[PDB]
Amino acid sequence: MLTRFLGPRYRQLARNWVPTAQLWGAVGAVGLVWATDWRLILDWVPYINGKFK
C-alpha cells in the first residue's frame, strides 16, 4: 500500500533530494566523528594528529 509513493514524479522527487541527503550525511559523519574524537577515523586526517604516534 506504500505504492501511493511509487511513480515517475516520486522518482524525480527522490532524485532532487539525493545530493541534499548525501551532504547531510557528510555533515553527520564528520560531526559524530569530531565530537567523540573518533580515534579510528581521525588518525587518517593529515593535521589533527594531536595523538602523536
Binding site: 515517475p8 514524479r9 524525480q12 522527487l13 532532487n16 533530494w17 541534499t20
Partner: protein, 446 residues
C-alpha cells in the same frame, strides 16, 4: 489535421523596414477587413527627471486635443466619423498611440498618427484644462489599492532611481509643469530612431512603407550632436514599504525579487515557473482541485481573495514575484504558502508540473495574440525591446527547452536566498516582519 507545430509556421512573417529617418516601419498582414496601426516610442517616466516627471503622461492628455492642421476637436470628428478608435498608453519605458480602423482607412489612420506625433498644438488653455483632469485622475488612482501597491513596490525596489517614480508624476509636477517643459521633453524624445510605426491586418507592407515615407519623412532631418539619450541601470533594493490603514477592508501585498530584464532568455523559464504557481480569484470554478498548490490551498482555506504572479520587465532589470489580496488574519498564511512554492520550485520542481506550466505559456502566448490590436502592440513594442519580432515557433522552441532542471536552476538564481522588495497597503498588522520574509527566501533543509 494540421498539427500545432505546423500551425506555428503558418503565421506570416512580420515585415520590417526603415526610412532614412531611422523610423522602423513594421507590419503583419492577415487579410482581415479591419486593422490596427500606431506608433511605439520608447519614452516613459524612466526617462524623466525629478523635475519633469509626469511629462509624457501630460502629453498623452494633450495628444488628441488638436494638432496644427486639425486644431481643437477636429481630430475626434475625423476618427469618430470613420468609425475608428483612437487610444494611447504610457508605461515607464514605453508610449503608444494607435488607431483601430477599417482596413481601407489605413491611409488616413496613418496621416492622423503623424499629425498627432509631430504637430501636437499644446495650446496653453488646453494644458491648463488638463492640469485639473490629471489631478483628478490622481485622486481617482488613490482609490485603487492595487495600482497604489505596485506604485509603492516600484518606489521601494528602485528607491533612488528613475524607475522608482510613477508615470503620472507627483501632484506638484502636475501643478508646475509648463508648456516649455513639454515641448523640450517631446523634442528630446519623440525622435525617429526611437519610434516604430506598426500595423496589423488587411494591409500590405509596401502601402505602410509608402505612407511612412509620405507622412513621416522629416523627423530626424536633424538628429542630435551631443544630446544624451542614454539609460542608466537601476539599482534594485531589498526593502519594504508598509502603508498601514486599518480603515480599508482588505490588505494588498506585493513581493518581488529582482528580475533580469527584457533581453534575458531566463524570462522563458521564469514565466513557466510563474504559470505553475498561477493566479487565483474567488470567482474561479473549482478551488480544491486546482493544480497550483498555492491556488488550491488558498481556495480551501480561504487565505485569499485573489493573487497573481508576475514578471515585469524593464531594461536590464525587472520585478519578479506575486501580488495578493486578503483578509487581515490571513496575510501570514498567504506569505508562508507563496514562499513555500518558490522554495519548492527552486530546489524540488517535478517534470509534469513543468509540462503544465509550459502548456499554459503556449496557450497564453497564442490566446493573447488574437486580433489586430494585440498583434500590433506586439510588433510595435518588440521592435523597441528585442529589436526584431521573434516569431511564434522561436518562443515555442524556447519553451520546449525548459524542463524541471531549468526551472530549478533558473528559479534558484533569482529567488534563492535573495532580498525581496515588499510593498503593503491596508490592514497589514499581520504582515510578517522583513527579517521573517527574508528568512522565507531560503530553506534550512537545503
Amino acid at each position: 489535421t494540421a498539427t500545432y507545430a505546423q500551425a506555428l509556421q503558418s503565421v506570416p512573417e512580420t515585415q520590417v523596414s526603415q526610412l532614412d529617418n531611422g523610423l522602423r516601419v513594421a507590419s503583419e498582414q492577415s487579410s482581415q477587413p479591419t486593422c490596427t496601426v500606431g506608433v511605439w516610442i520608447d519614452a516613459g517616466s524612466r526617462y524623466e527627471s525629478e523635475k519633469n516627471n509626469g511629462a509624457g503622461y501630460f502629453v498623452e492628455h494633450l495628444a488628441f486635443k488638436g494638432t496644427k492642421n486639425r486644431p481643437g476637436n477636429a481630430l475626434e470628428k475625423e476618427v469618430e466619423s470613420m468609425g475608428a478608435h483612437l487610444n494611447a498608453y504610457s508605461t515607464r519605458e514605453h508610449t503608444a498611440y494607435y488607431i483601430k480602423a477599417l482596413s481601407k482607412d489605413l491611409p488616413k489612420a496613418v496621416e492622423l498618427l503623424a499629425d498627432i506625433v509631430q504637430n501636437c498644438s499644446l495650446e496653453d488653455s488646453q494644458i491648463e484644462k488638463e492640469r485639473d483632469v490629471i489631478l483628478q485622475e490622481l485622486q481617482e488612482n488613490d482609490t485603487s489599492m492595487r495600482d497604489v501597491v505596485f506604485n509603492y513596490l516600484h518606489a521601494t525596489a528602485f528607491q533612488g532611481t528613475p524607475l522608482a517614480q510613477s508615470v503620472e508624476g507627483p501632484s506638484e509636477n502636475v501643478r508646475k509643469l509648463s508648456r516649455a517643459d513639454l515641448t523640450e521633453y517631446l523634442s528630446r524624445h519623440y525622435k525617429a530612431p526611437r519610434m516604430v510605426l506598426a500595423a496589423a491586418g488587411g494591409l500590405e507592407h509596401r502601402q505602410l512603407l509608402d505612407l511612412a515615407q509620405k507622412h513621416f519623412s522629416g523627423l530626424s532631418g536633424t538628429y542630435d550632436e551631443d544630446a544624451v539619450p542614454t539609460l542608466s541601470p537601476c539599482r534594485f533594493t531589498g526593502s519594504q514599504i508598509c502603508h498601514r490603514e486599518d480603515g480599508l477592508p482588505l490588505a494588498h501585498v506585493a513581493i518581488a525579487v529582482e528580475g533580469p530584464g527584457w533581453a534575458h532568455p531566463d524570462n522563458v523559464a521564469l514565466q513557466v515557473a510563474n504559470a505553475i504557481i498561477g493566479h487565483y480569484d474567488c470567482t474561479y470554478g473549482g478551488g480544491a482541485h486546482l493544480s497550483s498548490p498555492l491556488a488550491s490551498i488558498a481556495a480551501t482555506n480561504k487565505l485569499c481573495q485573489s493573487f497573481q504572479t508576475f514578471n515585469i520587465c524593464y531594461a536590464d532589470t525587472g520585478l519578479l514575484g506575486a501580488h495578493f489580496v486578503c483578509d487581515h488574519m490571513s496575510i501570514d498564511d498567504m506569505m508562508f504558502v507563496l514562499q513555500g512554492q518558490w522554495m519548492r520550485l527552486c530546489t524540488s520542481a517535478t517534470e509534469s508540473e513543468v509540462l503544465r506550466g509550459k502548456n499554459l505559456l503556449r496557450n497564453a502566448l497564442v490566446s493573447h495574440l488574437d486580433g489586430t490590436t494585440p498583434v500590433c502592440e506586439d510588433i510595435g513594442r518588440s521592435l523597441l525591446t528585442y529589436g526584431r519580432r521573434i516569431p511564434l515557433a522561436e518562443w515555442e522552441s524556447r519553451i520546449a527547452e525548459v524542463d524541471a532542471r531549468v526551472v530549478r536552476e533558473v528559479c534558484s538564481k533569482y529567488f534563492y536566498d535573495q532580498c525581496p522588495a515588499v510593498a503593503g497597503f491596508g490592514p497589514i498588522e499581520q504582515l510578517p516582519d522583513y527579517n521573517r520574509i527574508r528568512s522565507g527566501m531560503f530553506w534550512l533543509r537545503f
